[PDB]
Design a protein around this ligand. Structure first.
Ligand SMILES: CC[C@H](CO)Nc1nc(NCc2ccccc2)c2[nH]nc(C(C)C)c2n1
Length: 288
């Protein structure tokens, strides 16, 4: 079974298991092989969910090539891409990723999200580390719909405030928040909200966007982890938060970072925003 694959090198530690670059001995294709990590035997719902995921195919979603439920273990075989967006951002720190490339990437991810969301599938843990790029200018979402299949230092920087405040049931809005954080980060070359605990993450959000109340976010004061005793921070103008993001970009971003999940712009509506009026598909500068 696994004898069909030859390890080439360790790619990294995923959320649900280790990932290796590998070669299929029969077909010669190079792939990304993931071993899913209480060992009793793969749960039936994990198997049905992942099998659902195999059929959710899109150019901006990393292809799930094979689900290998063998010997009471679970291996996932994925399409391989040569680099992730975190590494590419770090690589691009001195000059920044050119705006046209930022716009193209945001546009493509919004397409991927719109597609997943239209199928009622959430990502839940969007972050630069699981965004993957190739030499032809494509960007792809990895680990989509995995959270649902399996219910799990982890980064908090991209986590929506409703999650932080204890909301039990995520909506598609949590992915829009995350992507918004990543958008700002590509533009400014600085993480928007680099929290190192849940309360630090929350307080960093509060300090920038203002401490949320019933006016901006109805029902907020009733959430499991909301405290009347939260400090009261005033909101700051975005011109100060994300230069040199232009007026169209700042307008779109504001809509992606709305506190109330129900007011937060959808992936499909975001695609129609004037920010994408001049969108094009440039090629990244990659040296591997
Ligand atoms: C470890 C999980 C994350 C996202 O799944 N990484 C990560 N990185 C990649 N390539 C970037 C890379 C290439 C060579 C060396 C190091 C990194 C990937 N290609 N295909 C996959 C699937 C498992 C989603 C993948 N995952």
């Amino acid at each position: 079974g696994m004898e069909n694959f030859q390890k080439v090198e360790k790619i990294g530690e995923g959320t649900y298991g280790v990932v290796y670059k590998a070669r299929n001995k029969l077909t010669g294709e190079v792939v990304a092989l993931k071993k899913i990590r209480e060992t009793e035997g793969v749960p039936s719902t994990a198997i049905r969910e992942i099998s659902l995921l195999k059929e959710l195919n899109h150019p901006n979603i990393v292809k799930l090539l094979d689900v290998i439920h063998t010997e009471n273990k679970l291996y996932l075989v994925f399409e391989f891409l040569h680099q992730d967006l975190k590494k590419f951002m770090d690589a691009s720190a001195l000059t920044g990723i050119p705006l046209p490339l930022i716009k193209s990437y945001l546009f493509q991810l919004l397409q991927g999200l719109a597609f997943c969301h239209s199928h009622r599938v959430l990502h839940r843990d969007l972050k630069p580390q699981n965004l993957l790029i190739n030499t032809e200018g494509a960007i792809k979402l990895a680990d989509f719909g995995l959270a649902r299949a399996f219910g799990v230092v982890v980064t908090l920087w991209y986590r929506a405030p409703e999650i932080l405040l204890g909301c039990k049931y995520y909506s598609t809005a949590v992915d829009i928040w995350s992507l918004g954080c990543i958008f700002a980060e590509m533009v400014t070359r600085r993480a928007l909200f680099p929290g190192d605990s849940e309360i630090d993450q929350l307080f960093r959000i509060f300090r920038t966007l203002g401490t949320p109340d019933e006016v901006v976010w109805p029902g907020v004061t009733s959430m499991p982890d909301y405290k009347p005793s939260f400090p009261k921070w005033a909101r700051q103008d975005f011109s100060k938060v994300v230069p040199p993001l232009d007026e169209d970009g700042r307008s779109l971003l504001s809509q992606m970072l709305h506190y109330d999940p129900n007011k937060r712009i959808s992936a499909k509506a975001a695609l129609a925003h004037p920010f994408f009026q001049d969108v094009t598909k440039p090629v990244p500068h990659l040296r591997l």
